[PDB]
């Protein structure tokens, strides 16, 4: 019974600003491609096998922060190091196009 | 009054009107040419009254306009010297500037203009040249690369006239560059000044500087040497030096040089020879007719070179 029971703390909610949370690390990840595939072919997979991805080659790649899609970029090579070039923040319409 | 002036010019005659136009400004000449042929009005009384009124007032300004620039030029020449008269006349001419920048381009130094218009399109260069003074344009093309020179000359030969809009555009482009800046580069000190500076220092430094100049460029050294001793200090030469130099001076060349010389110089130079020789020289000078200054200048230059060589050798003096 050490912990004190908190309740009724739903005072209000309003966005303050985006600098209170600024220096918080984000997990950025660029995605090469997607493919919907069942377990059928999944175990059929051996070493050296090739899995085709739904994404057409040369299309803009997807950029996610903490696993949430935010933007579409393009992959570039700078000094032998892989790099993405941000092209456009995705729209809610393409977000749902992605969902379906 | 312009219509009356046009009518008077038409009634005067072709030669008088042409002379007046040659003594008239461009805008005034154009207006007079246009109005006279355009609509001409003759009045039995009004024209006569206007002519009488105009004639009644031409008393004081007529004498001034008869001789204004010539008198100023003569005064400048007689006041200080030919070198200073040229600078004074240049300043007086530059006092009246030009509005359109194209004409202002011919008051600029040739190299500045050549650098300014080198990168322009060859046709634009050609258009600038026929609007520019001929002397300046020749210097500009001289500074221009031979390929560009030939191309621009060919464009000049077959010019076909500019659109008024393009000409106005070029005019305002040049105006925007050269209107708020002064292009009157004052040139003080050429070779006359260098010779005067040299003549007043020590002999060892004199020979050192003249040989240095000769090493740099022989033509400049010779021009400095000629400006060093003009054909006017011969009156200060010693009688013995004059007699010594007379032994190497041709009689015809000496007479040609002394034909335009000052009477005092001739009298001083006639005291070194014999009485018969002096009388013969005087008779030859009296009988000699006027001649072009080109040959007299060459004869005087030869005599001065001989005198300078004698002095450098060490067989002449001054005083």
């Amino acid at each position: 019974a050490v912990f004190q029971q908190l309740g009724g703390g739903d005072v209000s909610g309003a966005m303050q600003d985006i600098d209170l949370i600024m220096d918080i690390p984000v997990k950025l990840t660029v995605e090469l491609g997607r493919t919907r595939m069942t377990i059928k072919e999944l175990l059929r997979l051996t070493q050296g096998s090739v899995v085709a991805l739904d994404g057409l080659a040369g299309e803009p790649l997807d950029i996610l922060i903490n696993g949430y899609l935010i933007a579409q970029g393009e992959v570039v090579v700078v000094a032998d190091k892989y790099g993405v070039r941000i092209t456009d923040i995705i729209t809610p319409s393409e977000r749902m196009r992605r969902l379906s | 009054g312009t219509d009356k002036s046009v009518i008077l010019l038409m009634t005067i005659g072709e030669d008088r009107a042409a002379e007046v136009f040659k003594h008239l400004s461009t805008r005034e000449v154009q207006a007079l040419s246009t109005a006279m042929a355009n609509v001409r009005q003759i009045s039995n009384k009004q024209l006569t009254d206007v002519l009488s009124e105009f004639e009644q007032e031409a008393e004081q300004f007529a004498a001034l306009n008869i001789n204004a620039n010539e008198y100023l030029r003569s005064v400048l020449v007689k006041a200080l010297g030919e070198e200073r008269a040229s600078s004074l006349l240049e300043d007086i001419l530059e006092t009246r500037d030009t509005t359109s920048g194209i004409e202002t381009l011919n008051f600029m130094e040739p190299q500045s203009a050549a650098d300014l218009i080198r990168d322009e399109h060859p046709q634009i260069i050609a258009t600038i040249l026929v609007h520019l003074k001929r002397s300046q344009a020749a210097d500009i093309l001289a500074l221009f690369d031979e390929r560009l020179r030939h191309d621009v000359m060919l464009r000049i030969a077959t010019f076909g006239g500019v659109q008024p809009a393009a000409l106005a555009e070029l005019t305002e482009v040049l105006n925007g560059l050269l209107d708020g800046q002064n292009l009157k580069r004052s040139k003080m000190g050429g070779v006359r000044t260098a010779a005067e500076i040299i003549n007043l220092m020590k002999t060892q430094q004199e020979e050192a500087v003249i040989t240095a100049v000769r090493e740099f460029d022989g033509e400049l050294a010779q021009k400095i040497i000629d400006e060093m001793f003009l054909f006017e200090n011969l009156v200060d030469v010693d009688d013995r030096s004059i007699q010594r130099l007379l032994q190497e001076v041709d009689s015809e060349s000496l007479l040609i040089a002394l034909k335009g010389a000052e009477p005092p110089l001739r009298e001083k130079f006639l005291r070194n020879m014999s009485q018969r020789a002096a009388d013969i020289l005087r008779d030859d000078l009296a009988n000699r007719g006027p001649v072009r200054l080109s040959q007299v200048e060459n004869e005087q230059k030869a005599i001065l070179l001989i005198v300078r060589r004698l002095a450098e050798t060490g067989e002449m003096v001054i005083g």
């Binding site: - | 009054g1 312009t2 005659g13 008239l24 300004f61």
Partner: protein
């Protein structure tokens, strides 16, 4: 009236012919003065 008009026209055509001769001598004496006076007349016309 016709005779008086003819006499006036003859005087005008005689004195103007004399005036034309007079303007030629003056312009030969001073050609630039006439151009300057003409330019001054145009300037004053403005």
């Amino acid at each position: 009236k016709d005779e008086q008009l003819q006499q006036r026209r003859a005087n005008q055509r005689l004195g103007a012919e004399v005036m034309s001769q007079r303007i030629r001598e003056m312009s030969d004496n001073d050609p630039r003065v006439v151009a300057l006076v003409i330019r001054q007349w145009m300037s004053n016309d403005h």
